[PDB]
mmCIF file of C-alpha atoms and ligand atoms in Angstrom:
data_model
loop_
_atom_site.group_PDB
_atom_site.id
_atom_site.type_symbol
_atom_site.label_atom_id
_atom_site.label_comp_id
_atom_site.label_asym_id
_atom_site.label_seq_id
_atom_site.Cartn_x
_atom_site.Cartn_y
_atom_site.Cartn_z
ATOM 1 C CA UNK A 170 -65.445 -72.451 -200.353
ATOM 2 C CA UNK A 171 -68.460 -74.785 -200.143
ATOM 3 C CA UNK A 172 -67.874 -77.312 -202.983
ATOM 4 C CA UNK A 173 -65.504 -80.286 -202.248
ATOM 5 C CA UNK A 174 -62.607 -81.855 -204.156
ATOM 6 C CA UNK A 175 -60.114 -83.536 -203.996
ATOM 7 C CA UNK A 176 -57.661 -82.042 -206.493
HETATM 8 C C1 LIG B 30 -65.288 -83.473 -196.456
HETATM 9 O O1 LIG B 30 -66.705 -83.487 -196.561
HETATM 10 C C2 LIG B 30 -67.271 -84.795 -196.203
HETATM 11 C C3 LIG B 30 -68.760 -84.686 -196.491
HETATM 12 O O2 LIG B 30 -69.373 -83.764 -195.488
HETATM 13 C C4 LIG B 30 -66.942 -85.082 -194.727
HETATM 14 O O3 LIG B 30 -67.444 -86.385 -194.351
HETATM 15 C C5 LIG B 30 -65.408 -85.050 -194.526
HETATM 16 O O4 LIG B 30 -65.066 -85.313 -193.154
HETATM 17 C C6 LIG B 30 -64.871 -83.689 -195.003
HETATM 18 O O5 LIG B 30 -63.434 -83.643 -194.855
HETATM 19 C C7 LIG B 30 -62.984 -82.677 -193.896
HETATM 20 C C8 LIG B 30 -61.481 -82.943 -193.591
HETATM 21 C C9 LIG B 30 -60.511 -82.482 -194.713
HETATM 22 C C10 LIG B 30 -60.464 -83.423 -195.908
HETATM 23 N N1 LIG B 30 -59.112 -82.422 -194.125
HETATM 24 C C11 LIG B 30 -60.871 -81.042 -195.169
HETATM 25 O O6 LIG B 30 -60.539 -80.116 -194.115
HETATM 26 C C12 LIG B 30 -62.370 -80.980 -195.534
HETATM 27 C C13 LIG B 30 -62.816 -79.570 -195.975
HETATM 28 O O7 LIG B 30 -63.179 -81.336 -194.351
HETATM 29 ZN ZN1 ZN B 31 -61.833 -74.548 -198.451
#
């Protein structure tokens, strides 16, 4: 990944 969140 590499992006973040949270969903
Ligand atoms: C998510 O990123 C922030 C910014 O670098 C960190 O401070 C944080 O500790 C990090 O969360 C960890 C723990 C978690 C939420 N269980 C996940 O594994 C994420 C990817 O990494
Ligand atoms: Zn991931």
